[PDB]
Design an enzyme around this catalytic site. Structure first.
Site, mmCIF file in Angstrom:
data_model
loop_
_atom_site.group_PDB
_atom_site.id
_atom_site.type_symbol
_atom_site.label_atom_id
_atom_site.label_comp_id
_atom_site.label_asym_id
_atom_site.label_seq_id
_atom_site.Cartn_x
_atom_site.Cartn_y
_atom_site.Cartn_z
ATOM 1 N N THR D 1 0.864 -1.202 0.000
ATOM 2 C CA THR D 1 0.000 0.000 0.000
ATOM 3 C C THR D 1 0.894 1.244 0.000
ATOM 4 O O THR D 1 1.829 1.307 0.786
ATOM 5 C CB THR D 1 -0.964 -0.003 1.197
ATOM 6 O OG1 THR D 1 -1.926 -1.053 0.998
ATOM 7 C CG2 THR D 1 -1.663 1.337 1.353
HETATM 8 B B1 LIG Z 1 -2.085 -2.112 1.845
HETATM 9 O O1 LIG Z 1 -1.273 -3.086 1.345
HETATM 10 O O2 LIG Z 1 -1.700 -1.734 3.107
HETATM 11 C C1 LIG Z 1 -3.664 -2.564 1.826
HETATM 12 C C2 LIG Z 1 -4.462 -1.350 2.267
HETATM 13 C C3 LIG Z 1 -5.935 -1.625 2.459
HETATM 14 C C4 LIG Z 1 -6.572 -2.264 1.189
HETATM 15 C C5 LIG Z 1 -6.691 -0.369 2.846
HETATM 16 N N1 LIG Z 1 -3.930 -3.662 2.745
HETATM 17 C C6 LIG Z 1 -4.056 -4.930 2.296
HETATM 18 O O3 LIG Z 1 -3.654 -5.283 1.190
HETATM 19 C C7 LIG Z 1 -4.568 -5.943 3.221
HETATM 20 C C8 LIG Z 1 -4.137 -7.217 3.484
HETATM 21 N N2 LIG Z 1 -5.016 -7.696 4.422
HETATM 22 C C9 LIG Z 1 -5.054 -9.016 5.098
HETATM 23 C C10 LIG Z 1 -3.638 -9.463 5.461
HETATM 24 C C11 LIG Z 1 -3.623 -10.860 6.080
HETATM 25 C C12 LIG Z 1 -4.329 -11.883 5.198
HETATM 26 C C13 LIG Z 1 -5.737 -11.439 4.841
HETATM 27 C C14 LIG Z 1 -5.757 -10.042 4.217
HETATM 28 N N3 LIG Z 1 -5.901 -6.745 4.781
HETATM 29 N N4 LIG Z 1 -5.633 -5.710 4.038
#
Ligand SMILES: *[B]([O])([O])[C]([C][C]([C])[C])[N]C(=O)C1=[C]N([C]2[C][C][C][C][C]2)N=N1
Ligand SMILES: *[B]([O])([O])[C]([C][C]([C])[C])[N]C(=O)C1=[C]N([C]2[C][C][C][C][C]2)N=N1
Ligand SMILES: *[B]([O])([O])[C]([C][C]([C])[C])[N]C(=O)C1=[C]N([C]2[C][C][C][C][C]2)N=N1
Lengths: 214, 212, 199, 201, 219, 196, 204, 199, 196
Positions: D1
């Site tokens: 992210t």
């Molecule tokens: B980012 O990579 O930080 C993103 C931001 C979010 C979408 C607002 N987060 C995620 O990709 C993400 C990953 N997960 C879980 C991690 C552990 C396994 C299940 C999913 N939750 N958000």
């Protein structure tokens, strides 16, 4: 219940034209020791429902006590309504799931058999709250040993007669005795039809040991 | 003792101009054995909403019952049927209430929105969700999603007309991806159940899959 | 697994159950746990199947060579010593108790327990997971001066009582009687086993 | 992210990527990582998607209630303090949320960083997420407070693009916003692959 | 994996399924699990796939040397002794679970050999994750001295039970019939499953794929 | 790690702290204030676990201010220091303890200048000079070598500069600027930042 | 896992009298990308290639030790190795490290030196072969690759159609994988020529 | 610890060993493990001494009150149910198996095993660490229709066999015979215990 | 954490590294050289676990020098890079592995300028530019944004300055001075130190 003490092994169940039949041995196991060789693991719930249970015997006795009272309570009203097999299966599912959610599960796997309004019922409920229905069922070690045989017969002849279902169940009991170390050659066979619930027992399977000479 | 179990199963949803499809296999498993070959994973919520669930079957049965009660409670206090988008918003809060002891369920909602267009919403177990054009969930989800990205989203293709997806094409594609998933994913098999949601209601169709 | 050997005037009676187990599954319901190390010397196996089989083969090989070098039938004590040596040397790696029983012209019928590298001569020995349930039974039923027939009956009864109670034991009962005249094998099938209080 | 924000002479720029992942699997490339609380207030999300989505929506509810009770519209500083007090009650329980609250109130453009530990900081520029260190490098190298609006949009797009090139957890498209006195405007939604190929040439 | 064998009136029948999986994904839909050890001795392998392959190859090689020196047909007991002595040496680390069947001068012989080196000689056996299902079919319907066709049907039904009941097994049933006279290797004896016909399809034209660079090298 | 330092003179207290707010390896803020004004003559310097410092300091600040509103006069530095310790110690064996290190500087009408040192376990100690953080290991001996009880404020500022210069040369962390404040009978005064 | 530390994906596809092998070009340590032109497919003859996915260090070591062995083989035997013989050679090399394995899953693609029959196979880290008639995949996004291959692959494809098929399979599969990508290289092996193409791919 | 209870026509015979152990040390060599819950109802204790003592006292109290409210002697099944209830409710915390035996006017002599919250009526029951060694013995020696004298002899023999083999059992043998006529206590001292194969 | 950086131009290679030698929280040395001259046109930049870096680098240096003594000509950068990887990978599964990260810069008569990146697991990669350490997270994107293949050495030095300036403002560690060297056809040249 995280540590089950006295446990029962497989419970079998198969639907047939106009009824359901379930089988379970009379062994209460303490680890690998065959401690209680004469305990019934099948209980009549009401006139249309029967229950077989594997796993912790004390938990099964407690469930039998609670279920038994519920049925008595309902019968006191005398209003013309009674618990169907489906309703009992649903109640059991909620009970198991609830216990599992508080991290204090009832260590049992159950098979519910019933006959109501010309329809045979066969339900499975495990300790995690996993529930479903099927034409044939087998808990514990029976899933790997009995189920395959049961399913094989139902793949060729979906609708069995009472006599066919009975013979098929006896064949499965013999295999379980040959290959399951926690099994015992003394079992009960419960049948539910339009006439009610009947429990035959104790029974024994005929065993062959011809291969030892080979 | 573990309060969860992996019971397998795959769910797919696709939204079209005036329809949505929710499909799933019917195998229920545990470990290396099969509990039953007749356990569909898609339930009807209203006449224009279907939910597909996959994961721990204990939580799948309980969550569906909870959603079914919340729809009745909402109808009693608002005097109308919950829409597809309000069901999606409400499910998010129900999943986030068990944020510390989660429902192990992957949900996918398929239905019509208020303007009668296809709507798909996908959820993770703790409630995060969004609207998508199509979505695969469950055991074979990583096998199916790349193929849907290419054949429905037209990704990685040049000199290709981005025509709207018809029901007929969408149905054949749904059957094909599940046939491919039954070959490779051990948890996916037995039969395919397809629910088509349109303004005329929900029609069902069943197709056989490999039994091994 | 339940094994037992009894000494009698002129020979020995050795017997065992036929169950091989892997957790709750019966991998072999008719296994022969009585293995000959020489013409008049046998050994009962308990514990790990792989360890016991390997030990028995190693010993049979060593005893065969020893017998051809000394130009005579090996003594039962020599067979027990060879088994004891292997069992003690590899105590950390081996999980198998090889009970020795046989007949020789010098000491007659002898029974040796060699569990863990410790060698002990006894009038009767019991081993395996199922032996714990019959300790009381053998202590009250054993009488000195028993004949071979009585020894065979005594052994069959004890094994049957253990098979009924022990989950790791079951199947059929293998029986061998060793004397100067030779080895007599016998198999008591499931439907011919002694019956006691069962319900 | 990867998310970023900076104040300049014409307001606040806010930009994010749109990737969500589970392990090595990319679960989505179209996540919206900017919440629009009201017309003069924005929240960015980073960390766990369910925690961010839920607590920022709860802030939006509180912001709206504040407006109905006081008839005045909450300030950026009070909104961020409300969020930081909310998540501070669950400290130590493994919540995962790194947010930027940005808006324009009576004291001018405001930018705050708030996270799950309770950290709350007011600042001129911030970056959050796994690709945030890469964004900082490009953003700090080309940042000037006297940037023109087009120049600020270009810096925001370059900082997100280069972070998605290096960080495996970032990618998809860049959503950019421009916070002004009269409120925020959605500037654009560009796919980062088109951008990086045009920078590569 | 489901592998099974039985001794019949004139010989041995070996059976296997053909599915090879990586965790929960099918990698190979047609893995051959019945391997040649010698002309009249075959082996079915379960457990760790690279261990089975290497172990049987090493054994076949040693058994061929043995038969070149002696000038006679190899015995099934020799194969069992070589295999079990090797497996015991590695203390279970070589995860080879095998069913060894063959016919020599002394008649048909069937053995099961386990990873730690233990073995058992039996008239019918099963191994692999589908072993309980196959074993239930054998316990229910095996009889001694069956005819070749009855034994072939029984072994097929036992493998088929594992194929339909165990998620680690699938694909086709392969069989190996060994007698004094011949060996019949029936790779694909039964094909109980198959991919569905497929309704619609997909098509990629000429330059659907955008290309950045290209080099051609003529041979 | 954050750095705090206090030097008590005959009629004033001098305090300083780094202005770095960090997130893992990046400095997110380079002008963060670690000082909290509790009252007209009391300063609370706080460092430690993220979230805790601000939550705790604000809680104390609100209670110190409430005391003044209810009585018409301010709590003395000594009473304030003990109030802070009491609260910190009460949460020590609870479910939500405060992992913070602090310095309380103040000027009392009758008692004069005071400097208090408090660790995270709530042990309170009055001292002529004190420091918190990893930097205290490199600067405490410098204060021991040059500090006298009658040191003037001009010499105290030079002494503080000596300590901060040592951090620039010996410490591995990047701390380029420090907040410098002095408390005396006329209240809290902001001195120029000491930057490198 | 050690197999996802560097990422990467490789796949081989069989066509009508031809074979195709493709791989991603990303070299990265965990989440950070280092280069976008890392070699994963090595030539092992005129019409024989090997693709290696897994730990980057072992990818280079296995390729180098295999080259060492193949070179000695060609000098001694005076001929080009057969595709199947190379598979055995590779399996033997990987099995030698049974207890302390190379973290790589090789994929072989080629045409026999005399009959030009297409051959493909895949081995695991221990050295177990999987000879197939359609395709083989290896890497962090194998599940995605299986999906793409199972629904797109057709028998008897000509060089042009085979190229399109493997290209689409790899592109869509690596796009759903975080640590795989940054370009795709494809080799189309025909009896008379070798065609190498780099595809236009996402760089995020 | 070894406890045993047998049903006979008209009453019950219950007995046990007298050893209390703490590791390898004998803390009490003459402990009475037979505790009366009511005039004709007894319970044998095995497992944790503290848990069993606390449970027995709780039950005796509940049964005493129950008996005065119902104006009659409590049934043996009621005593077993009360013990079962406490044992099941606190299964996670309690480590003690309270075996119940007694006589009432409705069902006569009854023996109930209530280990872990599970209630089972049996013709004879055995418990404690030492009971594992006498399973074979009781299964082969038990005969239906035994008299009280035979029951007393049967119980004494079984306990003696267990005491000799089990390290946790020993000392003297406590014996109580319950009938309609009343409770008869008996103590078999160390030098008066049955002797079997010992060397 | 230490910082390494290499930028390859059309006919030269530019390298730089921090000069801090640290022991826990104190900078024991502020002018430590992290570059090792293997030959006339090859530089080996090494960072990592204490003890290992010097032991490993010296071992390579001695072998590279021995090659030149035995043959009369120097090993090329490519051959040297592969020799280094081979050795590092051989100790990877041994009892005494070398936990080091490195960059190999060199100039080959026929091949020209080369920059090699090697992690501790012995994966070798040729690259236009590269960096090692925690600082690489804040500077790699800067190189991605401004680097072109035909960048001149004057622009490369300015590009390096940009990266180092970013470390001064964003990085939490104190790295005030850097060693700067350039390798081309005339050999290894020492540029002025970049200090802050
Ligand atoms: B980012 O990579 O930080 C993103 C931001 C979010 C979408 C607002 N987060 C995620 O990709 C993400 C990953 N997960 C879980 C991690 C552990 C396994 C299940 C999913 N939750 N958000
Ligand atoms: B007995 O239970 O002790 C018995 C005696 C042996 C045959 C000498 N042992 C076993 O039951 C037994 C089973 N196994 C293995 C379990 C895993 C599969 C291979 C056999 N080892 N000993
Ligand atoms: B028996 O061995 O099971 C016996 C039965 C009891 C008396 C009901 N139990 C014990 O031996 C025993 C000993 N202890 C404690 C050990 C530590 C010191 C206090 C006594 N608990 N049960």
């Amino acid at each position: 219940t995280q540590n089950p003490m006295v446990t029962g092994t497989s419970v079998l169940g198969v639907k047939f034209e106009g009824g359901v039949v379930i089988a379970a041995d009379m062994l209460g196991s303490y680890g690998s020791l065959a401690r209680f060789r004469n305990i019934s693991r099948i209980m009549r719930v009401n006139d249309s429902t029967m229950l077989g249970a594997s796993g912790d015997y004390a938990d099964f006795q407690y469930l039998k006590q609670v279920l038994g009272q519920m049925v008595i309570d309902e019968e006191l009203l005398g209003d013309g309504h009674s618990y169907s097999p489906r309703a009992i299966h649903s109640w059991l599912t909620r009970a198991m799931y609830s216990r599992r959610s508080k991290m204090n599960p009832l260590w049992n796997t159950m098979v519910i058999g019933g006959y109501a309004d010309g329809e045979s019922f066969l339900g499975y409920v495990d300790m995690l709250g996993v529930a479903y229905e099927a034409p044939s069922l087998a808990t514990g070690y029976g899933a790997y040993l009995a189920q395959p045989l049961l399913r094989e017969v139902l793949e060729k002849q979906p609708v069995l007669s009472q006599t066919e279902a009975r013979e098929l169940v006896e064949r499965c009991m013999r295999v379980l005795y040959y290959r399951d170390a926690r099994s015992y050659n003394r079992f009960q066979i419960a049948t539910v039809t339009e006439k009610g619930v009947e429990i035959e027992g104790p029974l024994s399977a005929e065993t062959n040991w011809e291969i030892a000479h080979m | 003792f573990s309060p969860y179990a992996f019971n397998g199963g795959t769910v797919l949803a696709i939204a079209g101009e005036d329809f949505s499809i929710v499909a799933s296999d019917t195998r229920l498993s545990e470990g290396f054995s099969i509990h039953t070959r007749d356990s569909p994973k898609c339930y009807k919520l209203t006449d224009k909403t279907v939910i597909g669930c996959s994961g721990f079957h204990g939580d799948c049965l309980t969550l569906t019952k909870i959603i079914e009660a919340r729809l009745k409670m909402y109808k009693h206090s608002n005097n109308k049927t919950m829409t597809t988008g309000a069901i999606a918003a409400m499910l998010s809060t129900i999943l986030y209430s068990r944020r510390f002891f989660p429902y192990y369920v992957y949900n996918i909602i398929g239905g019509l929105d208020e303007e009668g267009k296809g709507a798909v919403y996908s959820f993770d177990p703790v409630g995060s969700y969004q609207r998508d054009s199509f979505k695969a969930g469950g055991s074979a989800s990583a096998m199916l999603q790349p193929l849907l990205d290419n054949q429905v989203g037209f990704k990685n293709m040049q000199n290709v007309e981005h025509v709207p997806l018809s029901l007929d094409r969408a149905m054949r594609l749904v059957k094909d991806v599940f046939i491919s998933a039954a070959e490779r994913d051990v948890y996916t098999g037995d039969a395919l159940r397809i629910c088509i949601v349109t303004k005329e209601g929900i029609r069902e169709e069943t197709v056989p899959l490999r039994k091994d | 697994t339940t094994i037992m050997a009894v000494e009698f005037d002129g020979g020995v009676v050795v017997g065992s159950d036929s169950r091989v187990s892997a957790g709750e599954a019966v991998v072999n319901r008719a296994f022969n746990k009585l293995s000959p190390l020489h013409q008049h010397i046998y050994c009962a196996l308990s514990g790990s199947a792989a360890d016991a089989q390997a030990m028995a083969d190693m010993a049979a090989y060593q005893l065969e060579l020893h017998g051809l070098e000394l130009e005579e039938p090996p003594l039962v004590l020599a067979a027990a010593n060879v088994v004891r040596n292997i069992s003690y040397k590899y105590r950390e790696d081996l999980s198998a108790h090889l009970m020795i029983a046989g007949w020789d012209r010098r000491d007659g019928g002898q029974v040796y327990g060699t569990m863990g590298g410790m060698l002990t001569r006894q009038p009767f020995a019991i081993g395996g997971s199922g032996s714990t349930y019959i300790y009381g039974y053998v202590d009250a039923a054993y009488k000195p001066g028993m004949s071979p027939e009585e020894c065979r009956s005594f052994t069959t009864n004890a094994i049957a009582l253990a098979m009924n109670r022990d989950g790791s034991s079951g199947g059929v009962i293998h029986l061998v009687t060793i004397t100067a005249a030779g080895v007599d094998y016998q198999v008591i099938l499931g439907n011919e086993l002694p019956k006691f209080y069962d319900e | 992210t990867t998310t970023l924000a900076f104040k300049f002479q014409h307001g606040v720029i806010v930009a994010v990527d749109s990737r969500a992942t589970a392990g090595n699997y990319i679960s989505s490339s179209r996540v919206n990582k900017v919440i629009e609380i009201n017309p003069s207030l924005l929240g960015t999300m980073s960390g766990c998607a369910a925690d961010c989505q839920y607590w920022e929506r709860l802030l939006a509810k509180e912001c709206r209630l504040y407006y109905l009770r006081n008839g005045e519209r909450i300030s950026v500083s009070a909104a961020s303090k409300l969020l930081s007090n909310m998540v501070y009650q669950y400290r130590g329980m493994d919540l995962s949320m790194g947010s930027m609250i940005c808006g324009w109130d009576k004291k001018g453009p405001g930018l705050y960083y708030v996270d799950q530990n309770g950290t709350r900081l007011s600042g001129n520029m911030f970056s959050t997420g796994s690709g945030s260190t890469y964004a900082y490098g490009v953003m700090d190298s080309g940042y000037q407070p006297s940037l023109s609006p087009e120049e600020a949009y270009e810096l925001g797009r370059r900082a997100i693009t280069y972070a998605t090139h290096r960080d495996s957890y970032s990618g998809g498209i860049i959503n950019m916003y421009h916070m002004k006195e009269d409120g925020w405007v959605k500037v654009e939604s560009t796919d980062v692959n088109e951008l990086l190929h045009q920078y590569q040439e | 994996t489901t592998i099974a064998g039985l001794v019949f009136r004139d010989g041995v029948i070996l059976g296997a399924d053909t599915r090879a999986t990586n965790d929960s994904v099918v990698m190979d839909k047609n893995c051959e699990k019945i391997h040649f050890i010698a002309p009249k001795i075959y082996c079915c392998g379960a457990g760790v796939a690279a261990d089975a392959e290497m172990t049987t190859r090493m054994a076949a090689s040693n058994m061929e040397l043995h038969s070149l020196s002696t000038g006679r047909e190899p015995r099934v007991t020799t194969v069992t002794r070589l295999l079990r002595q090797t497996l015991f040496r590695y203390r279970g680390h070589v995860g080879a679970s095998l069913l060894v069947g063959g016919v020599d001068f002394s008649g048909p012989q069937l053995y099961s050999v386990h990873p730690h080196g233990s073995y058992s000689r039996l008239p019918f056996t099963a191994l692999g994750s589908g072993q309980d299902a196959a074993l239930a079919v054998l316990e229910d319907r095996f009889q001694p001295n069956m005819t070749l066709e009855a034994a072939q049907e029984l072994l097929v039904e036992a493998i088929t039970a594992g194929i339909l009941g165990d998620l680690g097994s699938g694909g086709s049933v392969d069989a190996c019939v060994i007698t004094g006279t011949g060996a019949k290797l029936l790779r694909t004896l039964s094909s109980p499953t198959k991919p569905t016909e497929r309704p619609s399809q997909y098509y990629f034209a000429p330059g659907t794929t955008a290309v950045q660079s290209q080099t051609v090298k003529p041979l | 790690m954050e750095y705090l330092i206090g030097i008590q003179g005959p009629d004033y207290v001098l305090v300083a702290s780094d202005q770095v707010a960090a997130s893992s390896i990046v400095q997110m803020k380079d002008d963060h204030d670690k000082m909290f004004k509790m009252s007209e003559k009391i300063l609370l310097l706080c460092v430690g676990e993220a979230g805790d410092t601000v939550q705790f300091a604000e809680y104390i600040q609100k209670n110190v201010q409430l005391y003044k509103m209810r009585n018409g006069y301010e709590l003395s530095p000594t009473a304030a220091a003990n109030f802070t310790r009491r609260n910190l110690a009460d949460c020590l064996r609870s479910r939500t303890p405060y992992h913070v290190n602090l310095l309380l500087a103040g000027y009392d009408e009758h008692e004069g200048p005071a400097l208090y040192y408090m660790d995270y376990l709530a042990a309170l100690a009055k001292a002529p000079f004190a420091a918190h953080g990893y930097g205290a290991f490199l600067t405490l001996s410098i204060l021991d070598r040059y500090y006298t009880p009658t040191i003037s404020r001009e010499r105290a500022v030079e002494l503080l500069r000596k300590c901060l210069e040592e951090l620039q040369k010996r410490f591995i962390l990047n701390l380029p600027t420090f907040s410098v404040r002095i408390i005396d009978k006329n209240g809290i005064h902001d001195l120029d930042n000491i930057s490198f | 896992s050690i197999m996802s530390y560097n990422g990467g994906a490789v796949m081989a596809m069989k066509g009508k009298n031809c074979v195709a092998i493709a791989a991603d070009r990303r070299f990265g340590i965990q989440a950070q990308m280092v280069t976008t032109d890392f070699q994963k497919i090595f030539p092992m003859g005129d019409r024989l290639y090997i693709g290696l996915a897994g730990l980057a260090t072992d990818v280079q070591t296995v390729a180098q030790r295999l080259k060492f062995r193949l070179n000695l083989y060609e000098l001694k035997e005076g001929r080009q190795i057969k595709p199947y013989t190379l598979m055995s050679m590779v399996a033997n090399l990987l099995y030698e490290k049974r207890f302390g394995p190379y973290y790589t899953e090789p994929v072989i693609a080629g045409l026999d030196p005399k009959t030009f029959k297409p051959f493909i196979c895949s081995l695991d880290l221990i050295g177990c072969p999987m000879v197939t008639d359609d395709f083989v995949v290896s890497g962090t996004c194998s599940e995605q690759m299986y999906g793409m291959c199972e629904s797109l692959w057709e028998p008897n494809m000509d060089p042009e159609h085979l190229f399109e098929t493997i290209s689409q399979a790899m592109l869509n599969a690596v796009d759903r994988d975080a640590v795989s990508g940054m370009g795709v290289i494809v080799h189309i092996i025909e009896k008379d020529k070798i065609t190498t193409r780099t595809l236009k791919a996402r760089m995020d």
